[PDB]
Amino acid sequence: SVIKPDMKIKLRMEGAVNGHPFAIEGVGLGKPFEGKQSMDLKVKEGGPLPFAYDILTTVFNRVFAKYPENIVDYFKQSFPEGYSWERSMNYEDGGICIATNDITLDGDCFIYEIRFDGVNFPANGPVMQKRTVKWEPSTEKLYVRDGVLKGDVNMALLLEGGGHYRCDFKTTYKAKKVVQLPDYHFVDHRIEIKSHDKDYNNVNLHEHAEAHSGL
Amino acid sequence: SVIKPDMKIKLRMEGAVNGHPFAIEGVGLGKPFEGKQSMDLKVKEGGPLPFAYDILTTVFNRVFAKYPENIVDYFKQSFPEGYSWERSMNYEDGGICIATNDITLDGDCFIYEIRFDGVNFPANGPVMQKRTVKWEPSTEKLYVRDGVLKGDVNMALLLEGGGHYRCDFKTTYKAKKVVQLPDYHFVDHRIEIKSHDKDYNNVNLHEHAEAHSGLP
Amino acid sequence: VIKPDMKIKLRMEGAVNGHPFAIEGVGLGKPFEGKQSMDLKVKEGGPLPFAYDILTTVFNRVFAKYPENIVDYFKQSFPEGYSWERSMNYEDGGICIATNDITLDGDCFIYEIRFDGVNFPANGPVMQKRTVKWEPSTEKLYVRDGVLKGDVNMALLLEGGGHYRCDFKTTYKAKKVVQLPDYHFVDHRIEIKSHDKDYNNVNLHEHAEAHSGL
Amino acid sequence: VIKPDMKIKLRMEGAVNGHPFAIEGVGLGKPFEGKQSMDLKVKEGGPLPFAYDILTTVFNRVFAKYPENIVDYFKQSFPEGYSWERSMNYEDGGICIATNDITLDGDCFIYEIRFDGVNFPANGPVMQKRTVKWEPSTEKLYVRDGVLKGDVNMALLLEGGGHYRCDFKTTYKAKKVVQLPDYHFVDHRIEIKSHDKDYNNVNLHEHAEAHSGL
Numbered sequence: 001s002v003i004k005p006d007m008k009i010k011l012r013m014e015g016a017v018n019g020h021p022f023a024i025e026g027v028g029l030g031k032p033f034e035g036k037q038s039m040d041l042k043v044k045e046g047g048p049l050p051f052a053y054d055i056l057t058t059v060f061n062r063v064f065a066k067y068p069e070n071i072v073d074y075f076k077q078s079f080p081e082g083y084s085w086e087r088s089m090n091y092e093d094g095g096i097c098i099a100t101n102d103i104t105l106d107g108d109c110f111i112y113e114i115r116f117d118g119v120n121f122p123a124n125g126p127v128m129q130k131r132t133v134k135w136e137p138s139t140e141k142l143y144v145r146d147g148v149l150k151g152d153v154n155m156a157l158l159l160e161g162g163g164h165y166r167c168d169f170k171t172t173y174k175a176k177k178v179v180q181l182p183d184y185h186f187v188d189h190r191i192e193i194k195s196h197d198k199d200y201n202n203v204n205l206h207e208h209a210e211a212h213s214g215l
Numbered sequence: 216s217v218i219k220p221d222m223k224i225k226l227r228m229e230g231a232v233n234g235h236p237f238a239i240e241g242v243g244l245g246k247p248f249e250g251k252q253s254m255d256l257k258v259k260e261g262g263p264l265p266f267a268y269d270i271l272t273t274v275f276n277r278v279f280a281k282y283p284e285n286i287v288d289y290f291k292q293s294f295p296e297g298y299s300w301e302r303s304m305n306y307e308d309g310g311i312c313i314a315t316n317d318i319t320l321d322g323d324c325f326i327y328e329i330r331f332d333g334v335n336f337p338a339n340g341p342v343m344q345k346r347t348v349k350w351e352p353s354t355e356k357l358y359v360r361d362g363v364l365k366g367d368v369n370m371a372l373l374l375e376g377g378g379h380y381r382c383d384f385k386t387t388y389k390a391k392k393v394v395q396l397p398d399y400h401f402v403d404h405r406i407e408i409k410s411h412d413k414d415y416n417n418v419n420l421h422e423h424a425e426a427h428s429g430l431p
Numbered sequence: 432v433i434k435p436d437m438k439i440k441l442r443m444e445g446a447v448n449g450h451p452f453a454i455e456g457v458g459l460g461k462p463f464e465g466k467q468s469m470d471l472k473v474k475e476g477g478p479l480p481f482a483y484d485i486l487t488t489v490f491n492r493v494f495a496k497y498p499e500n501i502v503d504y505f506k507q508s509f510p511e512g513y514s515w516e517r518s519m520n521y522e523d524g525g526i527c528i529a530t531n532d533i534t535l536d537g538d539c540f541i542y543e544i545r546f547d548g549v550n551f552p553a554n555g556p557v558m559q560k561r562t563v564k565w566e567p568s569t570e571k572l573y574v575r576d577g578v579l580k581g582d583v584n585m586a587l588l589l590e591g592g593g594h595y596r597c598d599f600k601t602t603y604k605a606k607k608v609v610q611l612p613d614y615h616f617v618d619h620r621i622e623i624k625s626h627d628k629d630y631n632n633v634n635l636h637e638h639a640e641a642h643s644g645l
Numbered sequence: 646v647i648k649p650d651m652k653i654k655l656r657m658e659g660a661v662n663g664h665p666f667a668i669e670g671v672g673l674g675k676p677f678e679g680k681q682s683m684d685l686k687v688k689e690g691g692p693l694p695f696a697y698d699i700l701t702t703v704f705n706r707v708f709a710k711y712p713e714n715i716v717d718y719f720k721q722s723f724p725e726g727y728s729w730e731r732s733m734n735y736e737d738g739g740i741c742i743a744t745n746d747i748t749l750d751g752d753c754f755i756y757e758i759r760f761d762g763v764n765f766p767a768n769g770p771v772m773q774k775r776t777v778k779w780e781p782s783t784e785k786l787y788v789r790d791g792v793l794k795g796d797v798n799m800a801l802l803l804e805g806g807g808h809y810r811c812d813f814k815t816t817y818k819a820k821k822v823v824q825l826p827d828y829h830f831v832d833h834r835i836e837i838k839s840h841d842k843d844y845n846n847v848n849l850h851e852h853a854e855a856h857s858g859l
Contacts, residue, residue, distance in 0.1 A: 016330055019299055019315040084234055086334035088311050094385065094522075096303050098313045098332045100234040115231055117313050117332045119301035120387055122361060136828045137858035139783035141798045143808045146338060152798045152810070154785045156828060164787045164828065166796070168812070170309065172335050184780050184802065190859045208859060214781030214834050215854075307738075351614045352644030354569035356584045358594045367584045367596070369571045371614065379573045379614065381582070383598070399566045399586065399594065403645035425645055429567025430618035430638065446759055449728050449744035514663055516763035518740045524814065526732045528742055528763045530663040545660055547761045549730035549742050550816050553790060576766060600738065602764050 002079045003032050003063070008109035009039055013059065015099075015116030018128075022046030026060060032076065035066030035209040038194075040202065048199035051121065052132040054157055057191055057205055059087070059099045059116050062151070062173065065187050065209035072182035073211075074149050078175035079105050088170035089155075095121040095167075126165045132157045137190040140169070144181045149173040153189070187211040217294045218247050218278065223324035224254055226275060230314070230331030233343070237261025241275055243420070247291065250281035250424040253409075255417065263414035266336065267347040269372055270304070272406055272420060274314045274331055277366075277388065280402050280424035287397035289357075289364050293390035294320050303385040304370075310336040310382075341372070341380045348373040352405040355384070357426075359396050364388040366402070402426040433462045433493065433506050438539040439469055443489065445529070445546030448558070452476025456490065458635075462506060465496030465639045468624070470632065478629035481551065482562040484587055487621055487635055489517070489529045489546055492581070492603065495617050495639040502612030503641070504579050504605060510535045511606035518600040519585075525551040525597075556595050562587045566594070570601075570617040579603040579611065583619070617641045647676050647707065647720055652753040653683055657703065659743075659760030662772070666690025670704060670756075672849075676720070679710035679854050682838070685847040692843030695765065696776040698801055699733070701835055701849060703743045703760055706795075706817065709831050709853035716826035717855075718786075718793050718819060724749045725820035732814040733799075739765035770809050776801045780808070784831040786817075793817035793825070797833070831855045 009028040016022065023046065028039025039060060043049060062085075067073040075083065082103045089097040097118035104111045121127045140153035151171040156164045189209050196203035224243040231237065238261060243254020256275060258264060277300075278290045290298065297319045304312035312333035319326045336342045355368040366386040371379040403425045411418040439458040446452070453476060458469025471490060473479060497503040505513065512533045519527040527548030534541045551557045570583040581601040586594045619639050626633040653672040659665065667690065672683025685704065687693060706729075711717040719727065726747045733741040741762035748755045765771045784797040799811040834852040 016315065018301055019317060019330075086234060088309070088335055092524075094303075096311065096313060098311060098334050100231065100332075100334060102234060115234070115332065117315075117330070119313050119315060120303055120385060124361060136785075136787075138785070139830060139858065141780075141782065141800065143780075143800060144806075145808070148338075154796045154798055156785065156787055158828065162788075164789065170335060184800065184808065186783065188859050210859070215832055215852075309736075351571075351573075352616075353571070354616065356566075356568075356586065358566075358586060358596075359592075360594070369582045369584060371571065371573055373614070378575065381573075399588065401569060405645045423645060430620050430640060446744065448730055449746060449759070516662055518738075518764055524732075526740070526742060528740055528761055530660065530763060532663060545663075545761065547742055547759065549744055550732055550814060553792075576768060578767075600764060 002105060003076045004108055005033060006031055009037070009112070010109050011060065011112035011114060013114040013116055017051050017118040018121055020046065020050070022049060030064045032063050033066065035064055036207070037064045038204070038206045040204055043201045047201050050128065052127045052130050053193070053196070053200045053203060054132040054135060055097060055118060055127060056116065057135065057193065059101065059114060060205060061103060061110060061112070062187070062209070063110070064207065065211055067211045071185050071211055071213065072180045074173065074175060074179060074182055077179035078177065081176040083173060083175045085174065086172045090168045090170070092166040093122060093125055095125065095127055126157065126159050131160045132165065133160060134158060134193065135191055137188065140187045140189060142187065143184045147181070149181065185211060185213050217320070218291050219323055220246055220248060221323070222247060224252065224327070225324055226327035226329055228271070228274065228329035228331055232266050232333045233336055235261060235265060237264060239271070245279050247278050248281065250279055251422070252276070252279045253419065253421050255419050258416045262416050265343065267342045267345045268408065268411070268415040268418060269347045269349060270312055270333060270342060271331060272350065272408065273384070274302070274316065274329060275420055276318060276325060276327070277402065277424070278325065279422065280426050282426050283428070286400050286426060286428065287395045289388060289390060289394060289397055292394040293392065296391040298388060298390040300386055300388045304333070304382055306342070306382045307380065308337050308340050310340065310342060341374055346375050347380065348375050349408065350406055351379070352403065355402040355404060357397070357402060358399050362396070364396065368404070400426055400428055433509055434538055435461060435463060437462055439467070439542070440539055441490070441542035441544060443486070443544035443546050447481045447548050448551055449549070450476065450480065452479060454486070460494050462493050463496065465494060466637070467494040468634065468636045470634050473631040477631050480558065482557050482560045483623070483626070483630040483633060484562040484565060485527060485548065485557060486546060487565065487623065488599070489531065489544060490635055491531070491533055491540060491542070492617065493540070494637060495641050497641040501615050501641055501643060502610050504603065504609055504612055507609040508605040508607065513603055513605045515601055515603045519597055521595065521597045523552055523555050525555060525557055556587065556589045561590045562595065563590060564588065564623065565621055568619040570619060572612070572617060573614045574611045577611070581617070615641055615643050647723055648752050649675060649677060651676055653681070653756070654753055655704070655756035655758060657700070657758040657760055661695045661762045662765055664690055664694070666693060674708050676707050677710060679708055680852055681708040682848065682850045685849060687845040691845050694772070696771045696774050697837070697840070697844040697847060698776045698779060699741060699762060699771055700760060701779060701837065702799070703745065703758060704849055705747055705754060705756070706831070707754070708851065709855055711855040715829050715855055715857060716824045718817060718823055718826055721823040722819035722821060727817060727819040729815055729817045731816070734812045736810045737766055737769050739763070739769065739771055770801065770803050775804045776809065777804060778802065778837065779835050781832065781834040784833060786826070786831060787828045788825045792819070795831070829855060829857055
């Protein structure tokens with residue numbers, strides 16, 4: 001079907017953090033059935049980001065998650081038409097990021113229309129002082145609410161010299177058409193920046209995901 | 216000085232809710248020393264707005280707040296330079312609105328560069344189905360944190376049919392230069408849409424703010 | 432009926448980070464003046480290992496001056512009285528929740544208080560007792576599901592300037608049907624007038640007035 | 646040390662929206678298997694007018710199967726033991742907080758538990774007893790200021806399908822110095838196996854295993 005073993009990705013992100021705009025474009029590819037992907041990103045406007053790049057990574061498609069036969073894959077059923085999602089990223093120190101990504105599909109390439117905004121970050125925080133090393137792996141909880149799919153997950157950014165920085169994720173998925181809604185379930189995630197340049201004008205990012213249930 | 220009894224307003228807001236972009240430019244004027252301001256907003260893009268126009272209103276200048284003599288005025292002190300603020304708006308039903316405003320000054324007219332974003336608003340919540348009536352008067356609490364000025368406030372939208380809809384504001388004001396930093400204090404608020412057509416493409420908005428110390 | 436001058440008796444039972452304590456108290460106040468004072472004594476778990484400041488706002492909106500044009504849910508609930516529950520969330524993850532059941536005996540209000548708070552950071556302002564006082568406040572009260580709710584942005588100034596934020600969420604419940612009021616505010620002002628070295632004894636005061644929009 | 650088969654003995658004293666209650670419990674489990682079961686008997690405040698489920702995750706991470714590659718904060722903390730504190734924030738505003746002090750007598754863990762919850766809507770799932778059970782979950786544990794933290798996105802599926810979200814914030818404090826683990830997870834699956842009409846009697850089971858994630 002539309003969901004081929006191998007696929008491409010085309011995306012652009014426009015946003016602002018603490019009132020300073022920026023834009024990013026990216027090209028990538030993944031295997032929707034293996035739940036793996038990869039993508040190169042470049043800062044098109046507003047470089048060099050004066051904040052931790054990590055806050056952005058998870059915004060850069062649940063379609064790339066390995067769903068077992070026993071669990072309805074809300075996300076793949078949504079295509080060709082596609083789906084969009086809304087996300088809340090509440091940081092333990094007050095910082096807050098809002099994001100949106102509209103997902104379309106051009107032939108064999110997913111196209112993302114991404115918005116991203118973040119405010120109230122302390123200048124002395126791990127975010128504005130770029131003290132983030134990476135996001136820890138996670139297990140997202142997803143459940144139906146009002147005919148759509150909700151996804152929540154407790155995230156953590158290990159900092160330099162140890163210690164963690166928590167953020168609570170609150171994502172909402174909305175399919176453009178009617179699809180089989182699934183039962184409560186989870187999706188383990190692992191996102192890492194493989195490489196990047198001095199100021200992150202160029203970044204290589206990878207994500208791995210697989211869904212499952214209780215135990 | 217720099218700020219005068221009567222000054223004008225020019226604003227351009229660009230933003231999105233639930234993923235739907237829109238643009239609104241506004242115009243208006245007010246009395247900075249009397250805490251009063253009026254403005255007529257107009258939806259230039261994304262109309263008709265699919266959500267309650269009330270969640271935008273507080274985003275459309277603390278300069279407009281009557282300040283007592285015994286309390287430092289962090290706002291009037293920032294110009295000619297000016298200041299910028301970031302706000303977090305958290306609604307009781309998961310809805311979260313984020314916004315920023317960069318206020319500069321052209322002669323006797325303030326210019327705003329606003330950005331507004333809100334997500335996760337329940338499809339059947341009060342906001343998306345536009346069942347709100349307006350904001351109740353309020354009292355903001357301003358305090359200093361890391362050399363800047365914070366300001367929090369418990370906000371409530373009166374819903375049609377009575378009952379309210381709570382939201383919490385968390386604002387951070389940043390003067391574009393070094394200015395005196397006030398002790399703890401409050402700002403009484405009261406905003407209202409005075410008029411507007413059926414889907415709020417055109418809106419007349421008013422506000423009156425008055426800062427004071429604690430009750431004695 | 433609520434007279435111009437009233438007395439107060441009370442006992443609190445609670446814990447902070449799992450460590451138990453108990454405090455009893457006596458006082459008086461002027462319901463219509465919105466003023467009151469009291470002397471509290473630590474009975475168990477003393478000397479207290481956390482800032483007393485977190486307990487004060489638990490130690491009765493009856494003691495708020497209410498203007499004629501605003502329904503006074505509180506002064507009405509008596510002689511039956513009312514009860515309340517409150518969530519107190521501090522920015523650093525410290526969370527306390529309390530309840531108070533207020534009854535009336537002659538001219539003396541009787542309080543049965545429960546206080547519990549957890550996850551206070553070992554080196555935070557609370558456990559390190561680095562708080563100075565609560566700043567005055569303005570509580571927002573609105574009817575919800577047939578009962579009255581009060582929310583307020585609170586803040587403690589810590590030693591050497593600086594503030595520590597906490598959000599209050601209170602639910603008040605009349606013991607018998609009373610008239611529900613419209614949306615209104617209550618300006619508060621709570622202060623510890625005196626205390627001995629370890630706070631085993633404390634004299635507390637509060638002043639408050641209800642009002643509507645600016 | 647900690648044996649392959651151990652016993653449990655506990656007592657919970659608490660309140661919900663101002664109404665006290667107490668529940669005694671006895672049980673056992675396989676600590677290396679992450680399996681445990683117990684029988685709960687209400688001793689006060691019965692019949693409980695609120696969803697029993699809000700209380701279940703309060704009724705010992707020792708009962709979780711830790712692989713060899715992860716430090717076991719809980720098992721190394723004996724026989725001194727440890728205590729924990731927890732915030733449970735529900736989406737409709739209800740808030741619960743608890744603390745458990747855990748000691749060891751031979752082969753029987755001994756829990757002294759406290760439980761408090763406020764602001765639960767009268768018409769909400771909890772007060773209307775509209776809950777079915779907690780959904781399985783994965784707890785995230787990381788170190789903070791010398792102790793262990795564990796947060797989880799919980800969810801009660803309600804009658805009529807649909808879920809009620811609750812955010813857990815737990816802090817684990819070993820009664821002695823023990824090695825601190827790196828970031829990790831603990832899947833959980835808790836459930837009531839049997840109960841009587843007013844839940845005065847309840848059999849509870851829990852299954853848990855620790856892991857490092859993909």
